[PDB]
């Protein structure tokens, strides 16, 4: 990202978050 201002929320997009955990929704079962 890039920022020209003090405030962190003024910064550009944060598009580097490639994590995935579909198991939250596809296998939400206690016992495998």
């Amino acid at each position: 990202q890039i920022n020209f201002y003090k405030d962190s929320y003024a910064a550009s997009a944060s598009k580097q978050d490639f994590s995935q955990d579909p198991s939250k929704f596809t296998e939400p079962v206690a016992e495998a």
Binding site: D7, Y9, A10, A11, S12, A13, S14, K15, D17, F18, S19, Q20, D21, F25, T26, E27, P28, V29
Partner: protein, 297 residues
């Protein structure tokens, strides 16, 4: 949670006739989604797939500038033989519900936290009066003032609420590039809620409406033409475009199918007939054995 930049590769598989191993069978009642692999349902080849996933990230899916408001007012002399009030301003209560594309994208998630970027795009025109030469479009100075809830509002173009000593206000011209600023994440809670199953008040009466979220008392944008009235008319239209940044989304949703009828609730009247009727969301086909687009040779 594994990192997924590129979609899954496909592994080579051979014939299989093993007992006790039934991958294509499964139990939907568990609430779990089928874990069957292409590799164990068919014979597959080795495929090294390099297709990216960046463009389904919620930051990109939601992080696009979208129209949330479009207000117009007549820029003229509103003073009459009785009242002196000038009214070349509009007040907009902020919300993401007046326009359906942005609304539905972000009702795909129950909770969202995002710092939002607002771009204001003003456009003028000359009103077609009984007799008026089109003498051009003036470069007026506009003032967009954020009025947080509880602060006194301007009820006139000449009001002195427009000092904006504390209230953030942005002055911009017609000819200049559109105004822009970043509003932070402002909910008194940890996220905005697109849906609120409750009532925003401690009282039971009918005046306390269902679905109104107290934490979404999001304040107001007051916009004014700083220039005083010209001898002639102009219709100023302001389009406000809003761009979520640093989005963080929770609890995906069943997508909206019915049209929105208002911004105060999620009520629906529906289509007269399919598609998107209350009794029929998908359009019809003659029979379950019918191909509407069967390939005929």
């Amino acid at each position: 949670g594994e990192i997924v930049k590129t979609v899954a590769n496909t592994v080579e598989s051979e014939i299989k006739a093993e007992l006790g191993v039934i991958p294509s069978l499964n139990a939907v009642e568990t609430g779990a989604t089928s874990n069957t692999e292409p590799e164990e349902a068919i014979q597959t080849r080795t495929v090294i797939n390099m297709h990216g996933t960046a463009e389904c990230l919620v930051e990109n899916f939601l992080g696009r500038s979208a129209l949330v408001c479009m207000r117009s007012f007549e820029y003229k002399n509103h003073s009459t033989s009785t009242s002196s009030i000038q009214k070349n301003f509009f007040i907009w209560t902020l919300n993401t519900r007046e326009l359906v594309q942005i609304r539905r994208k972000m009702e795909l998630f129950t909770y969202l936290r995002f710092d939002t970027e607002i771009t204001i795009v003003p456009t003028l025109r000359l009103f077609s009066s009984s007799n008026v030469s089109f003498s051009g479009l003036p470069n007026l100075t506009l003032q967009a003032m954020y009025v947080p809830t509880g602060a006194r509002k301007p009820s006139s173009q000449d009001s002195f609420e427009w000092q904006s000593a504390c209230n953030p206000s942005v002055f911009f011209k017609i000819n200049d590039p559109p105004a822009r600023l970043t509003i932070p994440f402002m909910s008194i809670n940890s996220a905005y809620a697109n849906f609120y199953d409750g009532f925003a008040g401690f009282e039971k009466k009918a005046t306390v409406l269902y679905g109104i979220n107290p934490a979404n008392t999001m304040g107001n944008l007051c916009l004014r033409v700083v220039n005083s009235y010209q001898p002639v008319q102009y219709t100023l239209t302001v389009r406000v475009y809003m761009k979520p940044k640093h989005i963080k989304a929770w609890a995906p949703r069943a997508p909206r199918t019915m049209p929105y009828t208002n911004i105060l609730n999620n009520n629906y009247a529906g289509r007269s007939a399919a598609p998107n009727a209350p009794t029929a969301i998908v359009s019809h086909r003659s029979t379950i054995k019918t191909m509407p687009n069967d390939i005929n040779l």
